[PDB]
Ligand binder design. Structure first.
Ligand SMILES: *[C@@H]1O[C@H](CO)[C@@H](O)[C@H](O)[C@H]1NC(C)=O
Ligand SMILES: *[C@@H]1O[C@H](CO)[C@@H](O)[C@H](O)[C@H]1NC(C)=O
Ligand SMILES: [Mg+2]
Length: 464
């Protein structure tokens, strides 16, 4: 029964491989030509393609490093393992896919680098401005003794770092860092302020931590007066907080979406008062370090990725990259299936899977199986191949220019042989008046020095 195998008329083992992860290739070389060479193992060794002449590579998943997840004792000595596993390897058939999983458990407070970017709008009464400060102060005083880090930037016409991470680290006095805040009282260059934060505030030189989560809390009082884009803030989690009379229209609220992360139902917050700032952050602080989101890094372009997530209570979520609502000690899982396209070239590739804001991350290495191991012992210009007119790799010939066939004997490109019997007019008659050979369901006429042989059946012989 012809399968997806065979039916392709494949002409080498690699093609045979490239058709499908199942299909297998024979190379007995002593096998009669009429037998197909690309089927499946338990159906191409019945036919006597001598066992072990068959090449049947299999994609496989091996686990390389497998840290256990860290129990509550979190003495950060040689770190805590918050991801298991974090390095595996994968060998792949042509366009194949194989399952594997990953577990996440937060064994730490959670490191965040938080930048307040607060408005200095001339629309602000001194009291309204003071509440924003007290808000920031109140946020930070609740977050003493945490893994938190704070920087704050006032912005108006200008952008000024009022104190950065390193300053918060060595002082830890929200009142003495912000006692210096003088009110800018100019317009609202939100685009510039955001770019300024993304490049100048989030600097390792200024106490910023690399792996720590990048969160931005933008507190504005009106629509931005500048233009542009916030491309550089791409990787910063951006909360935007519009306040006051200028966000009554649902229209005016939409302009804050460009600045804030997505979804905007989560990251855009509108208030009408300034008294709601106290009760605001209390509600927002919970979902900050609640959820884990998977970061995919240095990923190959030819790698299909489908997903499958387990979260709170054995819940099956197919394709989820983030289980939310979590608390320290809680474990989750993710089922991943990785498909590839074609057989690419480097055959060794490293890419990283990380949860956002973590040092630990699943780095998976991947090689690709594609070429049959029988491509060595290739024997170019093989005698079994019309003698030097083709290369006999793996029990089979594939040919040089012009020549074609089993061995490269059908030099004349004359379509597929179809029924062999084409070489003779009727059942009993021998093939082509016995002065030719039937090649690819066609007759090449015998060459003698006495006469030249013509005609579809080599019948006609003109001589000299
Ligand atoms: C901070 O927490 C540590 C232990 O968690 C405690 O020893 C210390 O007194 C606390 N100090 C403040 C200011 O919260
Ligand atoms: C998700 O997982 C199920 C089994 O858990 C599997 O059958 C399915 O193919 C997976 N879906 C995707 C899109 O990876
Ligand atoms: Mg304003």
């Amino acid at each position: 029964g012809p399968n997806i195998c065979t039916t392709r008329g494949v002409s080498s083992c690699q093609q045979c491989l490239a058709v499908s992860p199942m299909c297998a290739w024979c190379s007995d070389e002593a096998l009669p030509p009429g037998s197909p060479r690309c089927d499946l193992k338990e159906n191409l060794l019945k036919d006597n393609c001598a066992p072990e002449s068959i090449e049947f590579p299999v994609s496989e998943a091996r686990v390389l490093e497998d840290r256990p997840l860290s129990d509550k004792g979190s003495g950060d000595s040689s770190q805590v393992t918050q991801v298991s596993p974090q390095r595996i390897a994968l060998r792949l058939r042509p366009d194949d896919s194989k399952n594997f999983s990953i577990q996440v458990r937060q064994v730490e407070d959670g490191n965040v680098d938080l930048v307040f970017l607060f408005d200095g709008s001339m629309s602000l009464q001194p009291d309204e401005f003071q509440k924003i400060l007290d808000f920031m102060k109140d946020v930070m005083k609740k977050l003493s003794n945490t893994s938190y880090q704070f920087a704050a930037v006032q912005f108006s016409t200008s952008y000024k770092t009022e104190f950065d991470f390193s300053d918060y680290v060595k002082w830890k006095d929200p009142d003495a860092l912000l006692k210096h805040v003088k009110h800018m009282l100019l317009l609202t260059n939100t685009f510039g302020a955001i770019n300024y934060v993304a490049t100048e505030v989030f600097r390792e030189e200024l106490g910023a931590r690399p792996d720590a989560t990048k969160v931005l809390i933008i507190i504005t009082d009106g629509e931005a007066t500048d233009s542009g884009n916030i491309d550089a803030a791409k990787d910063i989690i951006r909360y935007i907080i519009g306040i006051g009379k200028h966000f009554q229209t649902k229209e005016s609220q939409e302009t804050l979406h460009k600045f804030a992360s997505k979804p905007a139902s989560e990251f855009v917050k509108i208030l009408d008062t300034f008294e709601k700032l106290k009760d605001l952050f209390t509600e927002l602080q919970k979902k900050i370090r609640s959820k884990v989101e998977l970061e995919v890094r240095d990923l190959p372009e030819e790698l299909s990725l489908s997903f499958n997530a387990t979260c709170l209570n054995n819940e099956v979520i197919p394709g989820l990259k983030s289980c939310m609502g979590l608390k320290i000690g809680d474990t989750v899982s993710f089922s991943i299936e990785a498909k590839v396209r074609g057989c690419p070239q480097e055959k060794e590739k490293s890419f990283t899977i990380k949860p956002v804001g973590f040092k630990d991350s699943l780095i998976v290495q991947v090689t690709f199986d594609c070429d049959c191991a029988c491509q060595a012992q290739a024997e170019p210009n093989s005698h079994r191949c019309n003698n030097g007119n083709g290369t006999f790799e793996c029990g089979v010939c594939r040919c040089g220019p012009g020549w074609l066939g089993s061995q490269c004997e059908c030099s004349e490109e004359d379509y597929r042989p179809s029924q062999q019997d084409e070489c003779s007019p009727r059942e009993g008659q021998p093939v082509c008046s016995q002065r030719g050979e039937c090649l690819c369901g066609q007759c090449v006429c015998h060459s003698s020095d006495f006469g030249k042989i013509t005609g579809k059946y080599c019948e006609t012989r003109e001589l000299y």
